[PDB]
Amino acid sequence: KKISQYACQRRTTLNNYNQLFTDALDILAENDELRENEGSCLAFMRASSVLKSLPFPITSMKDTEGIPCLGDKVKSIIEGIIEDGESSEAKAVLNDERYKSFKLFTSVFGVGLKTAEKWFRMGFRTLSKIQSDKSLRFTQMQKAGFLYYEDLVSCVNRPEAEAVSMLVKEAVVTFLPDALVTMTGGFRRGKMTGHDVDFLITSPEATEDEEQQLLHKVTDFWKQQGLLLYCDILESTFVALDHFQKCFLILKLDHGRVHSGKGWKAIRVDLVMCPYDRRAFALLGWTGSRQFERDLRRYATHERKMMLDNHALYDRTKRVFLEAESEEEIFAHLGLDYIEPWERNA
DNA sequence: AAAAA
DNA sequence: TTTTTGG
DNA sequence: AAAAAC
Numbered sequence: 566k567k568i569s570q571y572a573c574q575r576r577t578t579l580n581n582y583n584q585l586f587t588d589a590l591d592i593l594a595e596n597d598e599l600r601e602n603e604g605s606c607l608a609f610m611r612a613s614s615v616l617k618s619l620p621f622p623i624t625s626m627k628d629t630e631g632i633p634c635l636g637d638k639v640k641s642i643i644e645g646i647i648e649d650g651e652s653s654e655a656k657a658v659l660n661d662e663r664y665k666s667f668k669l670f671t672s673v674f675g676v677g678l679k680t681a682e683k684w685f686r687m688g689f690r691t692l693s694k695i696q697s698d699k700s701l702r703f704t705q706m707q708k709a710g711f712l713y714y715e716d717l718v719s720c721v722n723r724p725e726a727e728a729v730s731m732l733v734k735e736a737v738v739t740f741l742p743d744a745l746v747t748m749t750g751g752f753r754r755g756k757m758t759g760h761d762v763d764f765l766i767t768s769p770e771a772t773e774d775e776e777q778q779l780l781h782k783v784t785d786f787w788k789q790q791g792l793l794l795y796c797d798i799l800e801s802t803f804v805a806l807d808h809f810q811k812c813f814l815i816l817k818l819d820h821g822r823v824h825s826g827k828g829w830k831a832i833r834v835d836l837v838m839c840p841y842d843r844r845a846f847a848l849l850g851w852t853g854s855r856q857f858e859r860d861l862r863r864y865a866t867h868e869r870k871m872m873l874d875n876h877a878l879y880d881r882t883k884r885v886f887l888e889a890e891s892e893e894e895i896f897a898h899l900g901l902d903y904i905e906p907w908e909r910n911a
Numbered sequence: 912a913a914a915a916a
Numbered sequence: 917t918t919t920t921t922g923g
Numbered sequence: 924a925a926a927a928a929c
């Protein structure tokens with residue numbers, strides 16, 4: 566009957582009855598990220614996450630009793646929204662010049678907190694003024710970010726994600742016919758949209774060399790068809806992103822392939838290749854959500870004295886690595902009831 | 912910013 | 917009170 | 924040797 570402070574001990578489905586509160590908390594968290602207040606940022610992200618798990622809307626302050634991750638500052642914000650349907654705090658952030666510039670600049674692929682801060686201090690306020698500047702030097706990632714901006718800023722829907730899945734699977738089985746391809750991320754959690762389409766690729770019989778060459782073979786095949794708009798292949802190195810071999814792509818998705826102008830759409834696609842025995846850890850890590858993953862690792866450390874990541878699960882007391890053929894086995898090792906992928910939308 | 916140590 | 921917050 | 928990419 567007691568709501569846990571850990572997302573991995575909550576069922577969070579896509580039906581959010583508290584969007585008025587969580588949209589405001591998400592804006593306040595984002596501003597704290599920009600102001601480098603990591604602590605206050607994480608407190609607003611946890612409060613937003615717990616409200617997303619509620620099976621009813623908050624309509625009075627009494628409704629917040631017993632809910633964790635809701636301290637005094639957060640309850641003041643909830644009180645203000647109950648008062649007149651708006652957050653004065655979130656409204657002030659939305660009107661702030663630094664906040665507006667950071668949101669706009671980081672909306673470009675290849676632009677993060679550091680580059681957005683640099684451009685703001687240089688006096689830039691619009692993407693048109695940045696792009697047309699003759700002194701600025703752009704990374705290959707930023708050039709692609711600006712060239713395919715309108716397509717990348719529009720969300721990827723389910724017919725588009727499915728069309729991408731078909732392309733990925735048909736390219737992959739051409740070089741590794743026994744390979745298992747799984748769509749991960751938001752779409753695996755039941756989402757109708759996303760900023761990208763992510764896939765986990767694994768093969769039970771492939772060699773170390775075959776496993777290494779698959780992403781190169783698949784991207785060369787797409788490069789030949791003129792479908793590869795951007796490609797960054799990070800070699801495996803198996804504290805940041807995981808060491809598995811991965812690639813961050815922009816693919817040309819022809820309209821004819823989508824069962825739902827220029828006749829195509831630029832789509833952000835990420836592919837991850839992992840060894841067959843680590844497929845459960847990689848699937849769990851790549852399914853998300855971000856908050857679900859954070860709390861899984863926090864719970865493992867603080868409550869079980871275990872260490873979890875996308876590649877393994879280590880027990881510090883028994884001094885052994887724990888092995889798993891499925892996500893269910895990882896949850897069981899952690900002493901957690903199994904949370905379905907569509908229930909991990911924390 | 913909130914909860915654990 | 918001080919420490920931790922995915923790493 | 925910094926920045927972005929999850």
Ligand SMILES: Nc1ccn([C@H]2CC[C@@H](COP(=O)(O)OP(=O)(O)OP(=O)(O)O)O2)c(=O)n1
Pocket residue numbers: 749750751752756758759760761762763850851852853854855858859929
């Ligand atoms: N900081 C992060 C970012 C991502 N992930 C994991 C969970 C999701 C997976 C994919 O990353 P995203 O593409 O950013 O995830 P998303 O769930 O697919 O959100 P969206 O539907 O907008 O693409 O990696 C994580 O553990 N920590």
Ligand SMILES: [Mg+2]
Pocket residue numbers: 750751759760761762763
């Ligand atoms: Mg995604």
Ligand code: NA
Pocket residue numbers: 670671672673674675676677
């Ligand atoms: Na960006």
